[PDB]
Design a protein around this ligand. Structure first.
Ligand code: CA
Length: 223
């Protein structure tokens, strides 16, 4: 997250870190056994880390649970990033508490202008590289589909939305991928892609979670 703020420990209780020996992507806890992330974060050997603030220090509220299964969306296209969403099942159920909590799925799509909370452990610089140990947060609005398409000609599908600031300076970034965009208490987006980070006229692009609720629910119900 570039241009954001330190969230505070366990203030974003649905935020997960995906770990394969190291943090590599975010995710969102949607019930005691399932995490939603980006398909481009897929790999084997995932350990889900819940209850994290500093990802390099054991602070006392963590739960580390290996994944039993991951399910990339059936129509994910890694070239275009269309349908950039995946589900991860935990080998054992998380113990839910005030610091480790699910986030609700949307019941309708969000609108441009809605303020959302974007979070992660990704790069905090737009030029250069610095990776935080503690969770970072950014409040940002959803942008109109027409501004999004104009920013990224030929690249924005109906399964994507833009959020952020056209002036630059405030955005998600590498290492935030897979993490949450939460608006009014609902998971509306997944950190997906952008041109660089925090660049003028190049807002963040996010997977549009509301399009996937039926697939998520049906997949969980049978897996
Ligand atoms: Ca920790």
């Amino acid at each position: 997250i570039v241009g954001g703020y330190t969230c505070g420990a366990n203030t974003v209780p649905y935020q997960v870190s995906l770990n394969s020996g190291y943090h590599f992507c975010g995710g969102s806890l949607i019930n005691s056994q399932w995490v939603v992330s980006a398909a481009h974060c897929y790999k084997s050997g995932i350990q889900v880390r819940l209850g994290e603030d500093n990802i390099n220090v054991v602070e006392g509220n963590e739960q580390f649970i290996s994944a039993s299964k991951s399910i990339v969306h059936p129509s994910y296209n890694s070239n275009t990033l269309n349908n950039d969403i995946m589900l991860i099942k935990l080998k054992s159920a998380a113990s839910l508490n005030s610091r480790v909590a699910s986030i609700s799925l949307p019941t309708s799509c969000a609108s441009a202008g809605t303020q959302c909370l974007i979070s992660g452990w990704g790069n905090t610089k737009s030029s250069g590289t610095s990776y935080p140990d503690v969770l970072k947060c950014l409040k940002a609005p959803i942008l109109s589909d027409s501004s999004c398409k104009s920013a990224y000609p030929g690249q924005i599908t109906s399964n994507m939305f833009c959020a952020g600031y056209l002036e630059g300076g405030k955005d998600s970034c590498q290492g935030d991928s897979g993490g949450p965009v939460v608006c009014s208490g609902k998971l509306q987006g997944i950190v997906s892609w952008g041109s660089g980070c925090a660049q003028k006229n190049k807002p963040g692009v996010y997977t549009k979670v509301c399009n996937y609720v039926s697939w998520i629910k049906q997949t969980i119900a049978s897996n």
